[PDB]
Amino acid sequence: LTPQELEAYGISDVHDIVYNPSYDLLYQEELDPSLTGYERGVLTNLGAVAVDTGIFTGRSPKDKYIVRDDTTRDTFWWADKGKNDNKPLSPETWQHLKGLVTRQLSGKRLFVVDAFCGANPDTRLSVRFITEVAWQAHFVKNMFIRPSDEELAGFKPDFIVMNGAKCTNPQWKEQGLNSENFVAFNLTERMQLIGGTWYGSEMCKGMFSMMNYLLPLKGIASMHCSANVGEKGDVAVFFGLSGTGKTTLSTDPKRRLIGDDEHGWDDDGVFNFEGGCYAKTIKLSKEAEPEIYNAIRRDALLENVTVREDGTIDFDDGSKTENTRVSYPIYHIDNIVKPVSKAGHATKVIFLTADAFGVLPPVSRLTADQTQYHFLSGFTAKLEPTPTFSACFGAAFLSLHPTQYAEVLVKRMQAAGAQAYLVNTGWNGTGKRISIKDTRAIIDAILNGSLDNAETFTLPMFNLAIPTELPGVDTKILDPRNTYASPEQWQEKAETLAKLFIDNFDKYTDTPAGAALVAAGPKLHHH
Numbered sequence: 001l002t003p004q005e006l007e008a009y010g011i012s013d014v015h016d017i018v019y020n021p022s023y024d025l026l027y028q029e030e031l032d033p034s035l036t037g038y039e040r041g042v043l044t045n046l047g048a049v050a051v052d053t054g055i056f057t058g059r060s061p062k063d064k065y066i067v068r069d070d071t072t073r074d075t076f077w078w079a080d081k082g083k084n085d086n087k088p089l090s091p092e093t094w095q096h097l098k099g100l101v102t103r104q105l106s107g108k109r110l111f112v113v114d115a116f117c118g119a120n121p122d123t124r125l126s127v128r129f130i131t132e133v134a135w136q137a138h139f140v141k142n143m144f145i146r147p148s149d150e151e152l153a154g155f156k157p158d159f160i161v162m163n164g165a166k167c168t169n170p171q172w173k174e175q176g177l178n179s180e181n182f183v184a185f186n187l188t189e190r191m192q193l194i195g196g197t198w199y200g201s202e203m204c205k206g207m208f209s210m211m212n213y214l215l216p217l218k219g220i221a222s223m224h225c226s227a228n229v230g231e232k233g234d235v236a237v238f239f240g241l242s243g244t245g246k247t248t249l250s251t252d253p254k255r256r257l258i259g260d261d262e263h264g265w266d267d268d269g270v271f272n273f274e275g276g277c278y279a280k281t282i283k284l285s286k287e288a289e290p291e292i293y294n295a296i297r298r299d300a301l302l303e304n305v306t307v308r309e310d311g312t313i314d315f316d317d318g319s320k321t322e323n324t325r326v327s328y329p330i331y332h333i334d335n336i337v338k339p340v341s342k343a344g345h346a347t348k349v350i351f352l353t354a355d356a357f358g359v360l361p362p363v364s365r366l367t368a369d370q371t372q373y374h375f376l377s378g379f380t381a382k383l384e385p386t387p388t389f390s391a392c393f394g395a396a397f398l399s400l401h402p403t404q405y406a407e408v409l410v411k412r413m414q415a416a417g418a419q420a421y422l423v424n425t426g427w428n429g430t431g432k433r434i435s436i437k438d439t440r441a442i443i444d445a446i447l448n449g450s451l452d453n454a455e456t457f458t459l460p461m462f463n464l465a466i467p468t469e470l471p472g473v474d475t476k477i478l479d480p481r482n483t484y485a486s487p488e489q490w491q492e493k494a495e496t497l498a499k500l501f502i503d504n505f506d507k508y509t510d511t512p513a514g515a516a517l518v519a520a521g522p523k524l525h526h527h
């Protein structure tokens, strides 16, 4: 608000302050014909501005650091103490990084965006974002919850995010850091600092990481999931790692969207942390994903897409990155929950995975113990298939130990009588990905209760119950062995994958409860 207020954060000599920039002002800022470099936007024929995020086209987990002090020492899940990105940082080194950012933002025109993280007043964070790049302010205006005029009048930040993308750290070698870039958090000062990377989602996932610290410590599940609700009031959540289908599949014309990536689950039900959605656009098909496509219009913000001279978008071009994205406020989707993005208790819990090994079934109904086993496992794979095991389908954002997320999620699911399903949105023996059309039909059958009491057969080794039939889907692909020339091709790959699961899960077996969950995992006692 005032330059004296900004000085309290360490930022000096600010000549122009743009508080709560409007969408109209951000549009004209991005398209200012005198901008240079990665600040510049271009207007597409869809009416949305597109930007280039620079050398970073994704988050940088290797540059993530958390100050280790008496607030975080005994509560945080530290990288140096299972695998995670919560690397410890000294208070002294933090002060050096803070000097870099605050000096970079001193003497600049700054955008200040006030917003909320969390749909519920009783648990939301009030966050103040400070940046010198208009499209970064636009990103957080889209992705966080935009306060009302009454809420702005009494706004009191709980957390400050200072984005110094244009600065770098010359001392990183002597400070033992990964690179000249940094994404750093201090829970004593309640601040996030960013240097070197311009990428906007460091701010979203920085605050998600903070919600992931606070909410489970007070009994509230904090979840990397999309969520929607049917006309009957039945709520579903969709967990999964990146590219597995949370945004694609939750944006469903038969359902009201609650949110697409970050939710809590408290005594009243499931609630969104965010005010927008962050869709993948590589090979985007208007026919397959019409709601996402039709959200790409003025006030959406396209990232890293190829824009031709005539202003048309080549959505198929990944030569800068396969991670092309668009952010938009959530009301760019027609059928959403409003005026607050929340609903009741989830009764369907769907774990999405993209299995590049071609082993897992398109749909399995999970036992209670299998639900815990596969939630802690957090599997997906990419094309030679390369596995990722990321606890809770989102280990990059966990600030507490994985079992603390599992414990509170189990409590919420048991109290609501929820049923869980494992859905392979990836590959089978055809070497092709299951179609969006078939996957949507599988989701329909989960959501309408088709599968809750359906007859099943059991997949060997993983011991997964698979429905014998499903409306709208070719029965043949329900059994993953059927898309190989022989069940023998499937067995070889299944044993490889089972061994990966078993090795990965070992770390959890030093508690009685974790040891007991081994029996719910894949079983392999030869080779």
Ligand SMILES: Nc1ncnc2c1ncn2[C@@H]1O[C@H](COP(=O)(O)OP(=O)(O)OP(=O)(O)O)[C@@H](O)[C@H]1O
Pocket: 240, 241, 242, 243, 244, 245, 246, 247, 248, 249, 260, 261, 278, 279, 280, 281, 282, 425, 426, 433, 434, 435, 436, 437, 439
């Ligand atoms: N059968 C399928 N189901 C879901 N998505 C599919 C399928 N086949 C291809 N896709 C594509 O896979 C990608 C799914 O990405 P999506 O944006 O839903 O990931 P996400 O789970 O939301 O990840 P993030 O957490 O990174 O946002 C999209 O590009 C989508 O078009």
Ligand SMILES: [Mg+2]
Pocket: 246, 247, 248, 260, 261, 278, 279, 280
């Ligand atoms: Mg998504």
Ligand SMILES: [Mn+2]
Pocket: 224, 242, 261
């Ligand atoms: Mn995500």
Ligand SMILES: [Xe]
Pocket: 371, 372, 375, 406, 409, 410
């Ligand atoms: Xe779980």
